[PDB]
């Protein structure tokens, strides 16, 4: 750092990163009477004396189950119409084959979507189910979520951000990338003159995404954690049926077949207290995890709206670097965003001045910055080194040279003079 030195990049890099967000968790339902008492009427009548705890647990679980479908709907059903990619895949040299749907497979998922689907392994189910616990299928199948992601991809790559604000307005992909470059402070001529290099870098990054997902075992960590937490909670809930809770046995049929009612009531009540406590603990943990998953799903929906359906100026919200675009991919109980961003690469240091003194007038850059390579002075855009002659069109005049601190004498060319 010094008071007259600046660093400006002379090249760039297209970087594609992955962000994984849980969206929904397993929808579970619990039969209060079946879990606590099984199929014994004496236990059912004794439990009837405990009030309306069963209805509360049922309502809480139903609310969670509906909220999961709401989360998925909010994250993915953000597109009005199911757009389709054109059969011709000429997008300025950019190659989206690894993220576009693959019609060969029945699921019609992309290559990366298939990698994500295989990478998350589920956690056995029948034993948990046998004690009044059921798993409700999600409202949207995986095929429907894949269709939603395909529609979002087609809209993004055929209409830019226009489809998120109304009707989809087609635009060539190179011109869309030129608009994106304008959005981050780089003139579009940079994109048009480095189109081949930018397409090559984007294709290389997309190719590296596959290895990035496959190598790191903790990459798909959040979705796996959600699945493991659900499975562990269900396993604990089932294991709680083996506890005695101070009774003589943990099996209700043995109590019924060994004791008369007046003595069986004590043991049955001892079992009921513990089983009801375990059920309530499970429901409370499910509520807390559902709140966390809802927060994550709201974040995912916001990222879908602001990173995929538009270009975001928010720093680090859609990846590291200056955000260019984003692509969604479905995943088990979640979403994955491929954020394509622009990163300055090769910086050189130049001498800099805040203003140029000429004929007793102070000239300030209109859109760039004054730089010097040692002998001559130019004006260049801030995010990419592209020196140009200082004229009366690159700069504007404001006052004399007696106020600005660090002003440098130089000549300002006038196009009209020749």
């Amino acid at each position: 750092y010094s008071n007259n030195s600046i660093a400006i990049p002379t090249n760039f890099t297209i970087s594609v990163t992955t962000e994984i967000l849980p969206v929904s968790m397993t929808k579970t339902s619990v039969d209060c009477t079946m879990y606590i008492c099984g199929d014994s009427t004496e236990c059912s009548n004794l439990l009837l004396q405990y009030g309306s705890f069963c209805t509360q647990l049922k309502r809480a679980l139903t609310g969670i189950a509906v909220e999961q479908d709401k989360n998925t709907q909010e994250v993915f059903a953000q597109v009005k119409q199911i757009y389709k990619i054109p059969p011709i895949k000429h997008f300025g040299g950019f190659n989206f084959s690894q993220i576009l749907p693959d019609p060969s497979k029945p699921s019609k998922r992309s290559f990366i979507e298939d990698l994500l689907f295989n990478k998350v392994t589920l956690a056995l189910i029948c034993a948990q189910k046998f004690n009044g616990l059921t798993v409700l299928p999600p409202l949207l199948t995986d095929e429907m979520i894949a269709q939603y992601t395909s529609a979002l991809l087609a809209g993004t790559i055929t209409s830019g951000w226009t489809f998120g604000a109304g009707a989809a307005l087609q635009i060539p992909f190179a011109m869309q990338m030129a608009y994106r470059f304008n959005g981050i402070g780089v003139t579009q001529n940079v994109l048009y003159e480095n189109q081949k290099l930018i397409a090559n870098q984007f294709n290389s990054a997309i190719g590296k995404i596959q290895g990035s997902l496959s190598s790191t075992a903790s990459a798909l960590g959040k979705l796996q954690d959600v699945v493991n937490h659900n499975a562990q909670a269900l396993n604990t809930l089932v294991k709680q049926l083996s506890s005695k809770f101070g009774a003589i046995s943990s099996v209700l049929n043995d109590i019924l077949s060994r004791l008369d009612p007046p003595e069986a009531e004590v043991q049955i009540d001892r079992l009921i207290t513990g089983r009801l406590q375990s059920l309530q603990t499970y429901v409370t943990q499910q509520l807390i995890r559902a709140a966390e998953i809802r927060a994550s799903a709201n974040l995912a929906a916001t990222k879908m709206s602001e990173c995929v359906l538009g270009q975001s100026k928010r720093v680090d919200f859609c990846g590291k670097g200056y955000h260019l675009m984003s692509f969604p991919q479905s995943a088990p109980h979640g979403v994955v965003f491929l954020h394509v961003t622009y990163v300055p690469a090769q910086e050189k240091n130049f001498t800099t001045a805040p203003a140029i003194c000429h004929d007793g007038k102070a000239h300030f850059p209109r859109e760039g910055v004054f730089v010097s390579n040692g002998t001559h002075w130019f004006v260049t855009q801030r995010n990419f080194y592209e020196p140009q002659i200082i004229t009366t069109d690159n700069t504007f005049v404001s006052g004399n040279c007696d106020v600005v601190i660090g002003i440098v004498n130089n000549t300002v060319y006038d196009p009209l003079q020749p």
């Binding site: 039969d31 079946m34 757009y83 056995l124 034993a127 046998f130 999600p138 087609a154």
Partner: protein, 134 residues
């Protein structure tokens, strides 16, 4: 040879050796699940459909079902008149091949609605109008 009965991960008896024939019998709990009633508002109609959740339609049969034997429950507890969705067995709704916007969510991509015969219909929900950008 010394083992009598088997337990699963949850320590629930899932196999047993017969004392006389000395053969190994697997034990599976009898089918159960929730019952859901799909209905338009009573302001619209009194017709309903019944969804037995997570059970094959063949198992649904009034004779052994927890459903009552009242004539209407007899009608709504026969698996012969039942469509098999991934969410379970649906009785009292006709499956159509059209796709509409979801009205009553059944699950696994299946939705139900009331359309003017005026029975309950079940269909695959439509995600939206197909569009191809020029």
């Amino acid at each position: 040879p010394f083992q009598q009965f088997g337990r699963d991960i949850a320590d629930t008896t899932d196999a047993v050796r017969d004392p006389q024939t000395l053969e190994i019998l697997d034990i599976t709990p009898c089918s159960f699940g929730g019952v859901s009633v799909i209905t338009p508002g009573t302001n619209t109609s009194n017709q309903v459909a019944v969804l037995y959740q997570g059970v094959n339609c063949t198992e649904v049969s009034v004779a052994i079902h927890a459903d009552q034997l009242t004539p209407t429950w007899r009608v709504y507890s026969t698996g012969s008149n039942g469509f098999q969705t991934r969410a379970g067995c649906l009785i009292g709704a006709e499956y159509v091949n059209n796709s509409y916007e979801c009205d009553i969510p059944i699950g696994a991509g299946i939705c139900a609605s009331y359309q003017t015969s005026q029975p309950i219909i079940a269909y695959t929900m439509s995600l939206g109008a197909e569009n191809s950008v020029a």
